[PDB]
């Protein structure tokens, strides 16, 4: 649309320095039209302070604001008690607390499967060791958020449960066959798609899907599989681009442009202002030649915020 061209900042989710929205940060959000922020421990002191922080963010960012947080018993606990209704209700209570402070996005449920006992990558944070158990409690977690007006985001697609890292600088790999993936890693996401408004992708290489690129940078995975095979029309967000294995293998801006091209709607551009600025600069070169594609990405983000408005 002529009157409202897509800006590079509207495709990024950034982090903030502290518990208060300082003037320079406000000026910066407004300057670039940043539409999404993720909050962490460094931003959280009390419910009163957090409510003040999210109200300020909503005032600066406007009606499309996506205000996310990363993170009450464990997923393993709930998985084990195995009362689906309990899982839903605990997530419903968590979502009500988030809603009262002005947060409209939570990064759960984990749909990773803790399948390999001798390789607990996820551990406590998964609901179980098979797809069936993860699917059942994942459904409950999604519904508890959704019914309370908070967008949940399933992670980490296509499944972090059983990855192998050759070194701390190498991308983790999964070398299982497609049929194995279908029965395991992929099953909970596939089963839960119509209830999943957002999905966060994993910096993991799946040999059976795309032997050359991590999922977050893979057109075969984000577009071929998620969009085309599965018909997924929700938000795809990349995992944090500041994680070491990516950082050691790609430039920040290059990686973010590649994620958007591959099929992400939203890039998590976490880190100090200088790295955020470098990401903006790269996306600023991509956006003008890809206006229809980025319009579609922005509308997914906007549809999410309309459904789950931040204003407390």
Automatic annotation (TrEMBL):
Among Gene3D superfamilies, the record links this protein to: Glycoside hydrolase, family 3, N-terminal domain (3.20.20.300)
> Which keywords belong to this entry?
Glycosidase, Hydrolase
Q: Which residue ranges does the record assign to the Glycoside hydrolase family 3 N-terminal domain?
A: 9-301
Pfam families xrefs: Glyco_hydro_3
Q: Entry's PROSITE patterns? A: GLYCOSYL_HYDROL_F3 (PS00775)
**Record bears the keyword Hydrolase:** yes
Which GO terms of the molecular function aspect are on file? hydrolase activity, hydrolyzing O-glycosyl compounds
Q: Which InterPro entries does the record associate with it? A: GH (IPR017853), Glyco_hydro_3_AS (IPR019800), Glyco_hydro_3_N (IPR001764), Glyco_hydro_3_N_sf (IPR036962), NagZ_Beta-hexosaminidase (IPR050226)
Biological process according to GO: carbohydrate metabolic process
Annotated family: Belongs to the glycosyl hydrolase 3 family.
Name this polypeptide is given? Glycosyl hyrolase, family 3
**Record lineage:** Bacteria, Thermotogati, Deinococcota, Deinococci, Deinococcales
